[PDB]
Amino acid sequence: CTTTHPLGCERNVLEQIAATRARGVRNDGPKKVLVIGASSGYGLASRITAAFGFGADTLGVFFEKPGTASKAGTAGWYNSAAFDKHAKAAGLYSKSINGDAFSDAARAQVIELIKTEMGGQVDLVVYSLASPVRKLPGSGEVKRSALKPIGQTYTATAIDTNKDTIIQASIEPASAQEIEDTITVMGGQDWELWIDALEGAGVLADGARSVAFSYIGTEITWPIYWHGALGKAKVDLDRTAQRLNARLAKHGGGANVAVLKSVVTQASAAIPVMPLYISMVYKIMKEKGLHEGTIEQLDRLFRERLYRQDGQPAEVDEQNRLRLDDWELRDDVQDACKALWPQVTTENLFELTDYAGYKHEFLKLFGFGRTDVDYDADVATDVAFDCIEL
């Protein structure tokens, strides 16, 4: 999708705001929150849960393209503009930075705003799934991640989303360089640089916590999302989390990876097996009452793991990860997937899966397909908000 609808994006944001408010606005969770990757998907939902679910002041970092009078910007630009407008209306502090989250300049700008505008400290640092290209600070060398298996070719049933057909799709295995570079991009190195910088600047509150988002997914995609090159990066991420946890614990806080569920995203839409699995699991989970989108995931993370009213510590897996893919990875859900997977064809795709839902949710990312938006009305693409351009 090559265009976006600003008002649609605003209504998406308003829908998430309403959803978290409906779960109860709390005042005993985070107060000063930094979200790295704050403009879309899980990052955006985390910002909305923090601000509108917990009344927190927020600073978001993202890389998007601003709109001009004649050309639409990216969805994340309009999402963030909507967030800012409504957060300010709600009397909250809301500031944003548009630029490269991997860069030292982004860290410096964040630190300056925390010191000068936010009261001097943050108590929660959210680290969203990073971009797949990383310019290294100092050297300027650019590393690129690879979503490839290791050791052999990966082949799986998939959807050609341009034709609404079932295909077989294959991915060739990673080189050693691709494995290393994927660790460099999708591992924990930059997350640790952020915590380093914040600590060094004295802007981490006593008790500050950090959470980095991750994903494991289903058995049919294990060779690429759980194992493979990305899997090696996740090992690095998980290792980093436990290192950061010990570090922040010395000051009363902690750190965790939170493994989240499968949801429609721009990134995985490009990987043909994923629209198929997502479509399938959406249908199965909706029937079982277990379906969640980004805002439900983040509300459950905040309310049932990080800031439990019963004051108890969050439950974790063997690697000290928070798991919000708990409902998805139930035997009943996954077994139902296993039963349907071999049956799917072009002729029955829409009937065996929620592929209609997938297509709707994909267009929704960009602000299209809502039932409460007049898409015939004029669109103003030049939208300004409180955002520093690096």
Taking alpha carbons only, the member of 8, 3, 1, 7 closest to residue 370 is: 8
Which stretches of 149-272 are DSSP H helices? 176-186, 189-200, 228-249
Q: Which residues of 325-363 are buried (b: 16+ CB within 10 A; e: fewer)?
A: bebbbeeebbebbeebbeebeeeebeebbbbebbbebbb
Cα–Cα distance, 121 to 124 (Å, whole number): 10
- Token pair 């922040």: residue: 248
CB 142 within 8 A of CB 100: no
Cα–Cα distance, 189 to 182 (Å, whole number): 11
Helix (H, G, I), strand (E, B) or coil at 176: helix
Resolution of this structure in Å: 1.6
> What is the sign of the dihedral through the CA atoms of 262, 265, 268 and 270?
positive
The experimental method behind these coordinates is X-ray
Q: Which residues are annotated as a binding site for substrate?
A: 215
Domain encompassing residue 166: 1-390
Cross-strand pairs, 103: none
Helix (H, G, I), strand (E, B) or coil at 115: helix
Cα–Cα distance, 124 to 119 (Å, whole number): 14
Cα–Cα distance, 166 to 344 (Å, whole number): 8
- Which domain CATH number covers 30? 3.40.50.720
Q: Which residues are annotated as a binding site for NAD(+)?
A: 37-42, 63-64, 100-101, 129-130, 234, 263-265
Catalytic residue IDs: 225
CB 155 within 8 A of CB 149: no
Question: How close are the terminal C-alpha atoms of the chain, in Å?
Answer: 26
Helix (H, G, I), strand (E, B) or coil at 250: coil
Number of domains making up the chain: 1
Q: Strands 204-215 and 165-171: what pairing?
A: unpaired
Cα–Cα distance, 189 to 237 (Å, whole number): 8
Alpha-carbon Rg of the chain, whole angstroms?
Answer: 20
Q: Which residues are annotated as a binding site?
A: 37-42, 63-64, 100-101, 129-130, 215, 234, 263-265
Neighbours of 226 (CB within 10 A): 15
Q: What phi and psi, each to the nearest 5 degrees, are found at residue 203?
A: -110, 15
Q: What phi and psi, each to the nearest 5 degrees, are found at residue 123?
A: -110, -5
